Amino acid sequence: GPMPTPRQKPFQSGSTPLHLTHRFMVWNSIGIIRCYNDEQDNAIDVEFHDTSIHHATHLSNTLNYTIADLSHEAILLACESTDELASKLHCLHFSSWDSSKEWIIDLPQNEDIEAICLGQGWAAAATSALLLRLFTIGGVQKEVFSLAGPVVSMAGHGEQLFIVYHRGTGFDGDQCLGVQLLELGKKKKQILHGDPLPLTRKSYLAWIGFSAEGTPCYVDSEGIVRMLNRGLGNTWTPICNTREHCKGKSDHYWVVGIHENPQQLRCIPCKGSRFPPTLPRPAVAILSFKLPYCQIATEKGQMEEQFWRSVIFHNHLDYLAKNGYEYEESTKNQATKEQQELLMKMLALSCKLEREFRCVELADLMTQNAVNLAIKYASRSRKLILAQKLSELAVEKAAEL
Amino acid sequence: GPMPTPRQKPFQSGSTPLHLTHRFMVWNSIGIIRCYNDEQDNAIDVEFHDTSIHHATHLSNTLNYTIADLSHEAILLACESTDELASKLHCLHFSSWDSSKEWIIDLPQNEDIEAICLGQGWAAAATSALLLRLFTIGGVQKEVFSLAGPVVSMAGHGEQLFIVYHRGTGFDGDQCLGVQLLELGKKKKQILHGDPLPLTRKSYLAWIGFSAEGTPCYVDSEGIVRMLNRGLGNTWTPICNTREHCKGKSDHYWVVGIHENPQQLRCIPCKGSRFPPTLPRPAVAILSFKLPYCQIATEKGQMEEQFWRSVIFHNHLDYLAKNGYEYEESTKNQATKEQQELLMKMLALSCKLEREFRCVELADLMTQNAVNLAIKYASRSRKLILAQKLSELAVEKAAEL
Secondary structure: OOOEOOOOOOOOOOOOOOOOOEEEEEEOOOEEEEEEEOOOOEEEEEEEOOOOOOOOEEEEOOOOOOEEEEOOOOEEEEOOOOOOOOOEEEEEOOOOOOOOOEEEEEOOOOOOOOEEEEOOOEEEEEEOOOEEEEEEOOOOEEEEEEOOOOEEEEEEEOOEEEEEEOOOOOEOOOOOOEEEEEEOOOOOEEEEEEEEOOOOOOOOEEEEEEOOOOOEEEEEOOOEEEEEEHHHOOEEEEEEEHHHHOOOOOEEEEEEEEEOOOOEEEEEEEEOOOOOOOOOOOOOEEEOOOOOOOOOOOHHHHHHHHHHHHHHHHHHHHHHHHHOOOOOHHHHHHHHHHHHHHHHHHHHHHHHOOOHHHHHHHHOOOOHHHHHHHHHHHHOOOOHHHHHHHHHHHHHHHOOO | OOOEOOOOOOOOOOOOOOOOOOOEEEEEOOEEEEEEEOOOOEEEEEEEOOOOOOOOEEEOOOOOOOEEEEOOOOEEEEOOOOOOOOOEEEEEOOOOOOOOOEEEEEOOOOOOEEEEEEOOOEEEEEEOOOEEEEEEOOOOEEEEEEOOOOEEEEEEEOOEEEEEEEOOOOEOOOOOEEEEEEEOOOOOEEEEEEEEOOOOOOOOEEEEEEOOOOOEEEEEOOOEEEEEEOOOOOEEEEEEEOOOHHHHOOOEEEEEEEEEOOEEEEEEEEOOOOOOOOOOOOOOEEEOOOOOOOOOOOOOHHHHHHHHHHHHHHHHHHHHHHOOOOOOHHHHHHHHHHHHHHHHHHHHHHHHOOOHHHHHHHHHHOOHHHHHHHHHHHHHOOOHHHHHHHHHHHHHHHHHO
8 A cells, every 4th residue: 555755854945955064045036145164163145136225244153043034124044943052033134224233033942943034024934833923124023823734934025925834644755735825914814724735746845935026936846836826716827847948857946036027937957956056156047937738839829828828927916906016017018918919819810710619719808899800800701600799799798898 | 553545546427437348438417428448449429318419429539538528518528648649638519500510639748637527618627747727618728727636536517617636545444535616707716725525434436516506516435415505604515325215225326417406316226336337228216315314204303404405405596696697596486485384384393392492493594574474373373472582583683684
């Protein structure tokens, strides 16, 4: 019969393993942090993508840091439990307006920190004792709550938290994972209450986080990048297959950051290792989205993939409009126009294939000006029944528009 | 130590496995499909309960399209992966008005199909990539999204679609299944989120599907039939046990359909087998429901569940009316009268039994006009001490509404 597996360890996104003497602490869009320690000294280095917020700086390792995260306004540094010394967290609010420039938190004995994250004016940290705690960047503490299982990792953006934990045990190479989404809004909420996390068969989760536009995403060992489509009842859709971008087994990609719209998948191809070498530091490459649809080699398949890309390229922007955060309107304009153009090309090729059912099925999603243009496409080559039924669709939708 | 069980293999509802050369492949509410295979040749046969939909048809292909489904709009087919090719998915739009009668698509490298299903215009297939693919019958690719484990079966009706997959594995004869349910409307939703599937102890999932009105239903290997009560917070309610019917003359009852007006479960009786053989043509058996309400016998227990079976089915009709779908107003009108007269008879029974609190608490479940009728019944039976506080509760209901 099946054999139970050992449990894979927790991780912090951007933190390379501690067994290497010289290591990266965290990669962020705001900046990058590095660390070194050996038989006689220990040190931290921090640099920013834009030094107007703060100058690049060298920091010393007093609390034996192992975990980190960065924001536009503050930096968190934290560590795991230890018998002779407490687990601790240290926040450096470098952009502080007053004497709140830094503060420290030292946990109860045998309580740890395994993951932390930052957001808009708040900070968060969680322990392997199945609970999470919240803080504010000026130093006031916030609510505490407990987690459904052994916590693996967590991240956040704006005023929203993504948590990943172990919900059970896997068998014959499988791993058992679940996921939480929490909201720190005006009325705090939990839109996803502990569902099983989709993951490729016999894979291991490799990286979690958010795109710069504030929607959650992740990737596992088999390289299927996934993102939370809210238009599908908050369901995980694949968005890239980076093993196809790899040259072979020698390669694996380490994500530095993601931008949904404009499109940039920023990552480093690591050679012969699960993480980049700390020196000579590699350069970050930009990859592009590619969906696991069928008949990818066909041009119709390509425009189908582009349509289902473009709809989600504006769904998350509308979600930002609802929750109140800012976005650049050109992103919405380009996505919302290109989806109409792409599905109109789909409808035109369907009409040239004289599949009236396919034409109506595509026209069901369209705006009425495009339905009129589809009726004119049907009038070309004298497809009277297709034109009549598209007109019926137009009338039926106008009865409610 | 404790023994983990193997995961049960995938299955397509309304089918017989490959133990028989000319096995059943589909039996749905409007048609039947058969699958043929031998040492050198293979074929498929198509039938409808009325030839006005489409006449009997014979198909054959080099690939065994081992998976199929049937609907009033089209027939759906799919084949397994091979050493030479990956899987393909196929559609027969027999109900079309023109020459769009057929469609074919081939899936990416190394991919295989476990189960497929149909809906109102939509179609779907679970894949070995831990991805669900969704289409139209006209061949438009809808959303592709991720799943947490191997899918064991699939089903659909209207816009509501049913997925069941292994959450983990069971121990000592049991298995750990879980259920995820979507409704693919214009503002589509998730009804179940991979929650564990209730099943009888030491049993497996023998059949899934929908009742004719569109409620989700399934049956376990022990013969327990159960369905989703969406009105009661989306809870699974058992309705019947098939094995005991007809003094257990059949080894099993292979269900083919369910309907609420008249109350019917239509099945095939199976001798010495879990499933029926294809030949000679079987005789259909129709059974009444048997709710698991306690102290059932002597016609006083049975009237309680005769009340409750009504709402157990008819919570769905309120949904189907308020969402804009067509529904059976005859069933609505009849059930809302049956409930009140049955409650009045129960109130008379409890008054005859001098258990006046039962009369009061049935009156709480009445409607307002039926509360006034309860006052009249209590007056006719000269039980004024009951009628007093009954009138008090009537005034309270009138205050509420």
